[PDB]
Amino acid sequence: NVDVQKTQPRSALKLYQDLSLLHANELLLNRGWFCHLRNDSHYVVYTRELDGIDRIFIVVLNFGESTLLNLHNMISGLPAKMRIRLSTNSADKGSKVDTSGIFLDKGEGLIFEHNTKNLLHRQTAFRDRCFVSNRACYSSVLNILYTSC
Amino acid sequence: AESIDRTVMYYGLPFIQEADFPFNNYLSMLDTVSGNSVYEVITSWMENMPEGKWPNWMIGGPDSSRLTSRLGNQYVNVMNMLLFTLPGTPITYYGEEIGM
Amino acid sequence: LGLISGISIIVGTIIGSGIFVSPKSVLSNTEAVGPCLIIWAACGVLATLGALCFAELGTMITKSGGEYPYLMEAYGPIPAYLFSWASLIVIKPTSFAIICLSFSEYVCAPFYVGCKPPQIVVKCLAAAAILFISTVNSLSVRLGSYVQNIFTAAKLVIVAIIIISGLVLLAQGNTKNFDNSFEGAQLSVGAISLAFYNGLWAYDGWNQLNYITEELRNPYRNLPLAIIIGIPLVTACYILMNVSYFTVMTATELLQSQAVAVTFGDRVLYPASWIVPLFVAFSTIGAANGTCFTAGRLIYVAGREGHMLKVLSYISVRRLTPAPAIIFYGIIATIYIIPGDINSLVNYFSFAAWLFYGLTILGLIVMRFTRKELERPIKVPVVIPVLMTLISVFLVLAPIISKPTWEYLYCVLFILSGLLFYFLFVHYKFGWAQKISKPITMHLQMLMEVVPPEEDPE
Amino acid sequence: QPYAGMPKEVLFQFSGQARYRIPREILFWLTVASVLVLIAATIAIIALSPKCLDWWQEGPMYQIYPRSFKDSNKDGNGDLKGIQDKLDYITALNIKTVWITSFYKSSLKDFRYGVEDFREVDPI
Ligand SMILES: CCCCCCCCCCCCCCCCCC(=O)OC[C@H](COP(=O)(O)O)OC(=O)CCCCCCCCCCCCCCCCC
Ligand SMILES: CCCCCCCCCCCCCCCCCC(=O)OC[C@H](COP(=O)(O)O)OC(=O)CCCCCCCCCCCCCCCCC
Ligand SMILES: *[C@@H]1O[C@H](CO)[C@@H](O[C@@H]2O[C@H](CO)[C@@H](O)[C@H](O)[C@H]2NC(C)=O)[C@H](O)[C@H]1NC(C)=O
Ligand SMILES: *[C@@H]1O[C@H](CO)[C@@H](O[C@@H]2O[C@H](CO)[C@@H](O)[C@H](O)[C@H]2NC(C)=O)[C@H](O)[C@H]1NC(C)=O
Ligand SMILES: NC(=[NH2+])NCCC[C@H](N)C(=O)O
Numbered sequence: 124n125v126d127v128q129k130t131q132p133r134s135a136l137k138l139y140q141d142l143s144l145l146h147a148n149e150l151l152l153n154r155g156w157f158c159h160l161r162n163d164s165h166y167v168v169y170t171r172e173l174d175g176i177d178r179i180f181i182v183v184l185n186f187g188e189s190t191l192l193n194l195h196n197m198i199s200g201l202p203a204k205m206r207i208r209l210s211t212n213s214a215d216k217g218s219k220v221d222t223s224g225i226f227l228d229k230g231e232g233l234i235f236e237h238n239t240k241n242l243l244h245r246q247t248a249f250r251d252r253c254f255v256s257n258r259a260c261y262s263s264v265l266n267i268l269y270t271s272c
Numbered sequence: 273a274e275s276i277d278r279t280v281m282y283y284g285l286p287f288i289q290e291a292d293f294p295f296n297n298y299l300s301m302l303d304t305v306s307g308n309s310v311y312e313v314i315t316s317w318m319e320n321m322p323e324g325k326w327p328n329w330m331i332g333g334p335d336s337s338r339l340t341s342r343l344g345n346q347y348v349n350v351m352n353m354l355l356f357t358l359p360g361t362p363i364t365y366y367g368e369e370i371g372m
Numbered sequence: 373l374g375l376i377s378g379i380s381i382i383v384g385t386i387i388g389s390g391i392f393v394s395p396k397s398v399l400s401n402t403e404a405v406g407p408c409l410i411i412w413a414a415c416g417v418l419a420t421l422g423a424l425c426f427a428e429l430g431t432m433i434t435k436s437g438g439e440y441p442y443l444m445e446a447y448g449p450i451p452a453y454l455f456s457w458a459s460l461i462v463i464k465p466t467s468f469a470i471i472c473l474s475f476s477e478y479v480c481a482p483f484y485v486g487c488k489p490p491q492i493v494v495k496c497l498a499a500a501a502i503l504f505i506s507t508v509n510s511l512s513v514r515l516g517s518y519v520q521n522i523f524t525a526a527k528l529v530i531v532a533i534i535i536i537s538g539l540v541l542l543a544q545g546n547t548k549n550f551d552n553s554f555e556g557a558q559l560s561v562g563a564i565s566l567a568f569y570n571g572l573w574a575y576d577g578w579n580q581l582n583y584i585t586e587e588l589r590n591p592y593r594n595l596p597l598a599i600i601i602g603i604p605l606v607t608a609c610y611i612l613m614n615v616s617y618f619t620v621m622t623a624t625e626l627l628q629s630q631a632v633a634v635t636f637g638d639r640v641l642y643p644a645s646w647i648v649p650l651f652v653a654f655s656t657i658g659a660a661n662g663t664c665f666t667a668g669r670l671i672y673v674a675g676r677e678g679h680m681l682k683v684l685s686y687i688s689v690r691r692l693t694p695a696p697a698i699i700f701y702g703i704i705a706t707i708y709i710i711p712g713d714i715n716s717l718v719n720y721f722s723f724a725a726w727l728f729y730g731l732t733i734l735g736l737i738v739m740r741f742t743r744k745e746l747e748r749p750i751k752v753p754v755v756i757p758v759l760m761t762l763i764s765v766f767l768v769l770a771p772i773i774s775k776p777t778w779e780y781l782y783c784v785l786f787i788l789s790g791l792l793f794y795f796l797f798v799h800y801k802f803g804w805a806q807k808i809s810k811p812i813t814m815h816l817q818m819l820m821e822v823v824p825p826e827e828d829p830e
Numbered sequence: 831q832p833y834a835g836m837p838k839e840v841l842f843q844f845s846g847q848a849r850y851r852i853p854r855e856i857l858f859w860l861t862v863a864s865v866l867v868l869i870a871a872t873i874a875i876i877a878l879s880p881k882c883l884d885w886w887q888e889g890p891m892y893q894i895y896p897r898s899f900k901d902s903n904k905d906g907n908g909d910l911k912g913i914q915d916k917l918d919y920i921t922a923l924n925i926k927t928v929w930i931t932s933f934y935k936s937s938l939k940d941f942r943y944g945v946e947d948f949r950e951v952d953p954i
Contacts, residue, residue, distance in 0.1 A: 125370060125919070138349055139369040142356040143890055143924035153888065157318070157359040162311040171357065182357045184350055186307045211349035230346035232353040254318050254359065256326050257887075259880040267490045269878045292886060326887055334895050334931060356890075363891040366899060369923060480876070487882040493875050500868035503861055682835075689838055810834040817836055818845045819854055824835050 133213050145209065145234075150261065151180050158243040158253040160197050165190045166227065168197055172242045172253075174272070175261030179242070180208070181235040185227035192225040200241050209234040276320045283325045293328045293361070299354075300336040305343050314358070327360030332368055340371050373587050375594045381585055382602030384524050386419075387531065388659040389474040390574025391613055392633050392652050396626060397715055401567040405623050406553030408567075412614055415571040416607025418763060423578040423599045425733045425757050428750045430582035431592060432739075436829075437673040439579070439732045445743065446735030449679070450791075453798065455728050456674035457790030462783065463728075465704035466721040468663060470573070472501040472705065473714050475656040481631040482649045488630060491712070499706050501657060506702035509664040510688075510695045516661050523658025530651035531609060534633070537640050538616020546619045561766075562774025568767060569722040570715075574610060578603060579729070580666075592749040667701060668694035672825065678798060683813040686822035695820055720779040723768065724787065730764025733757045889926025896933050897954070907954045 128134035146152045155173040165187035171180040183192065195201060204219045211232040220226075220233075227233075244253035259268040276298075284290030298313045317327055331351050332339050340348050348371045355362040373381075399408045435441035438459070444452040476498040480489040509516050558564065581599070588594045617632060620639045629635045637648030671694075674680035688695045708717060736757045739746070772780050797805050816822070832844055844850070900912030910933065920928065935952045938944035 128370060135348055135352070135371040136369055139352055140923065142352060146356045146362070147889060147924050152357060154883070155359075159311075159314065159318075163307045165307045167307055167310050167314070167354075169357075171359075180357070182353070184310075184354055186305050186310050186347075186350070209353070211353060230344075230350045232350040234353070234357065256324050256359070257880060257883065258324075265490075265492050265875075267492060267875060268880055268882075269875070270880050271878050333893065361887060361889075361891060363893060363929070364923075364925075365893045366895065483876050484879075484882075486884070490875070490879070493872055496868045497872045500865050500872070503868070504865050507861060507865070689841070813834050814832050814836075817834075817841060818832065818847075818850045821841065821845050821854075823838055823841060 138211065138213060142209065149180075151176060151178075154257065154259070155180075156242070156244045156253055156255050158249055160252070166192060168194075170198075170243055172244060173259075173261055174242065174245075175263060177240050178236055178238045181205075181237055182232070183225065183227070183235070184232045185230065188229045190227055192227060194222045194225055200239065201237065205235045205237060207233055208236040276316050280320045280322070283322055286322070293326055295330065295363070296328050297330050297333065297336070299329060299331050299351075300333060303342060305347060310354070327358070328363060329355055329358050329360060330363045330365070331355055332365040334365070336365075338372060339368060345371065373585070374589055375597060378585055378588055378594060378598040379602045379605065382581055382598055383606055384527075385577045385580065385662075386575060386603065386606050387527065387609065388574070388577070389471050389652075389656040390576065391531075391610055392478070392631070392656075393470075393474045393714060394570045394574045395614055395617060395632050396629065397570040397718070398567045399623060399626055401563040401570075402558055403623070404554060404557050405550060405618055407557050408623075409611060409614060411564075411567045411571050412610050413607060415568065415575050416604060416610065418568075418572065418760070419575040419578045419607075420599055420603040421756050421760050422729065422733070423581055423603060424596060424752050425736055425760060426579055426582055427595050427599060428748065428752050429732065429736060430586070431595070431749045432746060435673075436583060436669065438670050439728060440670060440674060442732045442735060443728075444677075446732075446738045449677070449798070450794065451728075451731055452677075453674075453679045453794050454787060454790055455731075456670060456679055457793070458724050458728065458787050459670060460680070461704060461790075462724045462786055463721065464663070464667075465701050466708055466717050467576070468502065468660060468701060468705040469498075469708040470714055470717050470721065471656060471660045471663075472505070473498045473709060473712070473717070475501050475653055475660070477714075478631050478634065478649050478652045478656065481634050482646065484630070495709055495712055498709055501660070502702050502705045502709075505657065505660050505664060506698055509661065509667075510693050510698045511691050513691065513693045516665060520658060520661060523654055523661070526651045527655035527658060530633075530648065530655065531613070533641075534616050534636065535609060535612045538612065538619050541619045541640070542615070549618045549622055560774065561770045565767060565770040565774070566719070569771075570718055572726075573718050573722065575603075575606070576725075596750055664698055664701070668697040671697055673829075676829070681809065681813075682824075683809075683816050683822075685825060686817070686820075687825045689821050689823055696816065696822055716777075716779050719771070719777070720783050723771065723780055723783050726764050726767045727787075730761055730768065733764065734761045737761065885926060889924065891927040891929050892920060892923065892925045893929040893931070895931055897939075905954075909954070910951070 125136065128136040131137070151171045151173050155171045155176075157169060158172060159167075159169040165185060167182075167184045167186060169182055171182070181194075181198065183194070194205075201222045203223070204221050206217065206219050207215050210216055210218075211230065212228075215233075225233075243249040244255075258272065259270055260272055261268055279294050279296075282291045282294035296317060298317065299310075302309060302313070321327060331354075332342075336342070339351055343351070348368075352368070355364070395408075398411055399405075402408050402411060429442045433441050433445055439455055440452055443455055473494065476494050479497060480493055483489070585595060585598065588598075617626060617636060620636055621629070621632075625635070626632060631649070631652075633648050633652055634645075637645045641647065668685040671680055671685040675682040675685055684697045684700060685694060686696050687693070734757075736752075737754070740754070771777075796802060832840065894913065895908075896910065896913065897908045899908040900916050901908050902912035902915060903909060913928075913930070932939075932943045932945075933951055934943070934945045935947040935950040936943055936945050939952075
């Protein structure tokens with residue numbers, strides 16, 4: 124029920140509340156590009172990007188059973204260790220996993236925040252799998268959005 | 273209960289206005305979940321809808337079985353994470369945020 | 373000037389850009405419709421009881437300036453010096469910054485329909501209005517007064533459209549926003565005090581009423597009668613415009629609104645909604661063009677006592693304009709809009725202005741015990757400057773004991789920084805003081821071609 | 831000789847020199863050009879800024895079956911008054927839009943809703 128899940132830190136209501144808060148406070152989630160990778164029987168991996176903002180979100184969702192992931196073989200230029208922004212098990216918030224082996228339980232989802240300037244929608248090998256509505260770039264010196272890409 | 277090429281026609285034309293979006297229930301129709309089956313639902317909507325239109329996503333509703341009974345309790349948290357990291361408008365049926 | 377035409381200068385000076393900007397922040401502090409209309413009526417009482425106190429001092433003393441000869445007669449040279457310092461760097465450039473920022477809120481808002489315009493467009497269009505008005509008034513002494521008659525005409529057209537359209541819609545039964553007017557409010561002395569700051573900004577101009585309205589057919593009767601008629605006629609227009617806002621807007625829609633009059637003009641005048649950002653923008657740069665006319669009147673008389681730099685209030689030989697004082701006011705006004713933010717410049721202006729409003733009105737009560745034998749033609753009842761003094765103590769002390777923000781510290785540190793300059797350049801005439809000032813006076817004279825004004829006191 | 835407070839005629843023998851004519855002239859035309867740069871940079875940002883998002887694109891939607899949400903008058907049926915008492919819960923979910931399903935006066939409340947009166951609320 125609602126009342127018992129307001130006082131539990133690992134409840135479904137708490138994960139819903141900070142997923143909708145993160146969606147409201149981040150231009151990458153409510154406005155940014157959507158770039159999906161290749162298909163896989165276990166997991167779904169995609170990114171949320173925006174030009175002028177020099178960090179990305181990497182979403183890893185395991186829909187199969189328990190598997191291990193090598194994220195180096197999907198995205199080029201990642202560090203050896205990545206910090207978790209949000210997890211379906213909220214005990215793993217702010218923890219660091221290693222990029223070469225990421226262990227995912229059944230039904231586990233992770234959101235990574237990665238500082239980079241390598242956006243997938245600028246490369247020609249990923250442009251066919253990238254999508255936007257209301258295309259804009261971000262100017263960090265003026266704090267505006269502009270359309271002259 | 274419609275084909276994706278007929279659902280996309282409710283977006284209209286670039287010179288003729290129609291619905292802001294047609295409601296997407298294709299994730300609600302998944303009675304079992306998998307990496308390939310979630311991929312084909314996401315890529316069917318993004319490839320078929322017109323360029324520059326706004327997408328939307330639902331995982332349940334009043335005529336669909338509830339998600340923890342449809343897929344299991346282990347998929348409640350990851351289906352909510354999928355709903356809020358995809359582009360467009362997330363639509364939540366009541367009680368899904370609790371796991372009813 | 374008669375009596376009826378004396379009302380016209382009082383109303384035309386007070387009604388400005390304040391009623392188009394202030395209704396959001398009066399409602400934001402007293403969060404109901406009921407107390408919001410009590411505040412707009414109580415500031416009309418403070419403005420008429422304050423202007424009656426200035427009308428007594430203006431016929432008692434009869435020296436030009438502002439509050440500067442009134443403070444010299446009552447306390448001496450120290451609070452007179454602090455007024456000419458705090459009006460040079462605080463009061464007059466912030467008035468020019470609020471108005472030019474208020475012009476830019478209304479030009480930008482129709483281009484951002486459901487959206488909030490970014491701060492870089494608001495500030496770099498307000499900075500282009502400060503530089504353009506400072507350039508026009510420094511070149512073309514007669515051009516500013518010819519276009520002022522079509523800015524006053526455009527001002528009271530859009531005032532009459534809002535007042536009349538609010539009475540028509542209130543007649544048809546659009547009274548559902550006034551239903552439970554007193555549910556949800558603040559009896560906080562920091563929230564009541566900040567609703568008085570923004571309410572009294574729209575009434576600003578009651579203290580400059582003394583000098584240009586002494587040219588009447590019978591003063592000492594027509595001047596105090598122009599205040600009891602003129603300012604409560606403005607209070608009747610300010611309550612009626614705020615009632616006209618709440619017939620088409622909820623109190624929640626008025627808080628979530630960029631410019632409050634472009635929201636009104638979108639719900640009432642649909643196929644010609646662009647006349648509200650056009651006339652309010654004409655009314656606003658008319659309010660900024662008017663302040664650059666009197667630039668140098670207080671500068672000249674404070675320089676005569678040695679309390680101000682005399683290189684200001686010099687006059688250009690070609691284009692006989694007070695070009696050093698106009699250029700100096702434009703520089704401080706563009707510095708004030710970079711930290712910026714109307715609701716932070718209004719609190720910064722109102723703390724300095726009401727510190728010196730309550731010192732001259734207390735000086736009226738001092739000059740009844742210390743300065744008899746002084747021939748008072750206008751004489752107020754003594755309870756009027758007493759409560760106007762106690763209200764000015766409330767408008768100064770209550771913001772810093774309830775909600776002390778950082779602009780109240782920079783306003784104190786800029787006023788008391790003038791108190792150090794009094795003891796180094798006026799009280800102790802040091803030898804190295806005029807070794808600096810006359811080199812600057814001589815070189816700025818040849819750079820701008822400005823001479824001493826061929827003009828004695830009168 | 832220039833002292834400090836020169837008249838009109840002493841000033842003209844010195845104000846026309848080159849060290850006072852060009853720093854006066856470039857400081858006038860850099861201000862007139864800054865009015866036209868600050869105006870053209872305003873029309874540049876207004877014309878290049880994107881049309882920002884409508885309310886239905888911004889936040890999540892929340893679909894409510896009104897008979898099953900909150901009963902306020904103790905009859906076993908959820909009502910519209912019970913939805914009004916739970917609006918703080920909905921704002922704490924960071925919800926933008928509430929979607930209420932059919933509450934019209936009806937003879938049939940399932941099977942795509944046989945409606946009796948499209949301009950009335952059902953009494954339950
Ligand atoms: C960052 C914080 C600090 C910022 C300080 C920024 C200072 C910027 C100064 C910019 C001045 C711009 C002046 C141009 C305004 C034109 C307006 C106009 O229309 O003019 C008509 C007027 C008409 O002249 P006409 O064209 O000859 O008829 O044009 C002028 O007079 C232009 C003359 C330029 C005046 C420049 C004055 C600069 C004073 C600097 C002195 C500093 C002394 C400091 C000594 C310190 C000793 C301790
Ligand atoms: C055209 C625009 C610029 C022209 C006006 C400014 C002139 C440039 C010089 C600036 C000041 C240079 C140092 C002071 C020189 C005079 C000192 C002296 O001995 O006075 C004798 C002076 C008498 O000189 P006399 O006029 O030659 O008799 O005594 C006084 O007037 C006392 C009052 C001093 C008032 C100082 C005003 C300073 C204005 C600049 C303030 C800067 C902060 C702005 C606010 C902060 C940013 C928001
Ligand atoms: C669920 O109900 C139980 C029992 O009715 C509540 O648990 C405790 O009940 C005792 C009385 O028997 C109280 O003294 C305690 O204060 C209650 N515990 C707490 C933590 O409040 C419980 O509060 C109810 N609500 C939940 C679990 O959300
Ligand atoms: C990713 O999708 C591709 C193509 O849809 C899959 O490749 C083949 O797909 C056909 C029909 O879709 C099957 O009959 C073949 O058996 C598939 N080949 C293999 C080797 O599986 C592919 O399986 C999908 N999954 C991945 C790459 O994990
Ligand atoms: N001296 C001045 N012009 N002061 C500002 C006056 C503001 C004016 N009363 C208004 O409604 O906005």
